[PDB]
């Protein structure tokens, strides 16, 4: 009664969005190393029991639509949902290959009133992306 | 190292 109920037929969906290449208008460089991330995350979450799906070099529209449709699927038999974003970003924002889209709008699809079959279930979002330009020099 |  203090833990999320995990007794479902499946653990749930895991969506990985792996953005390596960007339109040069965006000013963004190639994210070398990200394929190794996506491979490691894939193997890892598959091992946990997730149904893993990997998407590559998505436009902002593709990311919005991809997540919208996932939120419209039937998660009744899933314990939870996970999404992993690998890309460029700035504060509150993440890059598609053709520009930026708010993190708020990607995750809003899974709100309780917009994704009833994930109601009372954990919705996890893992985000590898910059959130600004500040550097941490560290101490000691 | 690189920057995201």
């Amino acid at each position: 009664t203090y833990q999320y109920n995990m007794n479902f037929e499946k653990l749930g969906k895991c969506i990985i969005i792996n953005n390596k290449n960007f339109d040069k208008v965006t000013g963004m460089g190639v994210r070398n190393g990200t394929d190794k991330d996506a491979e490691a995350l894939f193997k890892c979450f598959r091992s946990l029991g997730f149904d893993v799906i990997v998407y590559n070099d998505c436009s902002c529209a593709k990311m919005q639509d991809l997540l919208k449709k996932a939120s419209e699927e039937d998660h009744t038999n899933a314990a939870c949902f996970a999404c992993i974003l690998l890309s460029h970003g700035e504060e509150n924002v993440i890059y598609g290959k053709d520009g930026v889209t708010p993190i708020k709008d990607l995750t809003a699809h899974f709100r309780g009133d917009r994704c009833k079959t994930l109601l009372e279930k954990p919705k996890l979002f893992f985000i590898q992306a910059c959130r600004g330009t500040e550097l941490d020099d560290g101490i000691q | 190292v690189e920057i995201d």
Binding site: Y4, C44 | D4
Partner: protein, 93 residues
């Protein structure tokens, strides 16, 4: 009866607001390396906040940058967990 529409989200950011996030072209991003490493060993037996706290620690202590640009030399990183979870989360049973 009712539940907040924003309830039961968890965001695991690779870094804190306003800050940069590091990536090794040869090895992958710091956050993902650490996340996968801890999940492989403890994904099945630790609660999600315990996992991400350990991710926070590993990124914070095991990583420091090298660059020919001194502006980007010997820099550090700390991840950032945002939880609206209402229960403890284990990936088993």
């Amino acid at each position: 009866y009712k539940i907040p529409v924003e309830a039961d989200f968890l965001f695991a950011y690779s870094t804190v607001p306003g800050y940069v996030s590091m990536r090794s072209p040869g090895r992958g991003s710091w956050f993902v390396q650490a996340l996968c490493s801890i999940l492989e060993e403890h994904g099945k037996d630790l609660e999600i906040m315990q996992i991400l706290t350990r991710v926070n620690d590993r990124v914070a202590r095991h990583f420091e940058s090298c660059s020919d640009d001194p502006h980007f030399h010997e820099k550090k990183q700390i991840p950032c967990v945002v939880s609206m979870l209402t229960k403890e989360l284990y990936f088993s049973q």
